[PDB]
Amino acid sequence: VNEQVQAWESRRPLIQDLARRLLTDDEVLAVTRHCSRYVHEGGVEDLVRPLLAILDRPTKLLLLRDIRSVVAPTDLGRFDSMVMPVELEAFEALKSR
Ligand SMILES: C[C@H](CO)OC[C@@H](C)OC[C@H](C)OC[C@@H](C)O
């Protein structure tokens, strides 16, 4: 928790600032709550699943960059198993336009 909580507290201003430029305030509050819950209680699938439902456009996926920095080392493989296919689909969405 502690290193991840420290990483979150140091990156929260960037994450929240970018989130508010891309999402509604209610969605920013949801992202904030999911990130805080994860760093304090763990469970990386419970962080990613709701984020992928909120971050529903390629530009919104930019938020996952700084969020990955708060993911505990033992959770990174799962995070990437879930997010990497979504990054590729988003590139396809930008390309097919
Ligand atoms: C979607 C967004 C940009 O497409 O990147 C996703 C997110 C998981 O960041 C990837 C990772 C943190 O950085 C990869 C770079 C540093 O090579």
Author numbering: 547 to 643
Per the authors:
PDZ domain-containing 7 (PDZD7) is part of the ankle-link complex, playing a vital role in the development of cochlear hair cells. The long isoform of PDZD7, which is indispensable for hair cell development, contains tandem PDZ domains (PDZ1-2), an HHD (harmonin homology domain), a PR (proline-rich) region, and a third PDZ domain (PDZ3). The PDZ domains are responsible for interacting with USH2 proteins to form the ankle-link complex. Interestingly, three hearing loss-related proteins (Harmonin, Whirlin, and PDZD7) contain this HHD, but the molecular mechanism of these HHDs is largely unknown.
We then determined the HHD structure at 1.49-Å resolution. The HHD adopts a canonical five-helix fold (α1–α5). In the structure, α1–α5 are aligned anti-parallel to one another, making a five-helix bundle with multiple hydrophobic interactions inside the bundle. The experimental MW of wild-type (WT) PDZD7 (12.1 kDa) matches its theoretical MW of 11.4 kDa, confirming that the PDZD7 HHD is monomeric in solution. Taking these results together, hydrophobic interactions inside the five-helix bundle are important for the folding of the PDZD7 HHD. A unique feature of the PDZD7 HHD structure is that the α1N helix turns back and contacts with the pocket formed between α1, α2, and α4. Val547, Val616, and Trp554 from α1N form extensive hydrophobic interactions with Val577, Cys581, and Val585 from α2, and Ile613 and Val616 from α4. Interestingly, this hydrophobic cleft between α1 and α2 is a common site in HHDs, such as in Harmonin and CCM2, and is required to recognize an isolated amphipathic helix on their binding targets. Structural superimposition of the three structures of PDZD7, harmonin, and CCM2 shows that the PDZD7 HHD is well-aligned onto Harmonin and CCM2, and the α1/α2 cleft of the PDZD7 HHD domain is occupied by α1N and is not available for canonical target recognition. However, the α1/α2 angle in the PDZD7 HHD structure is 25.3°, suggesting that it adopts a more compact conformation.
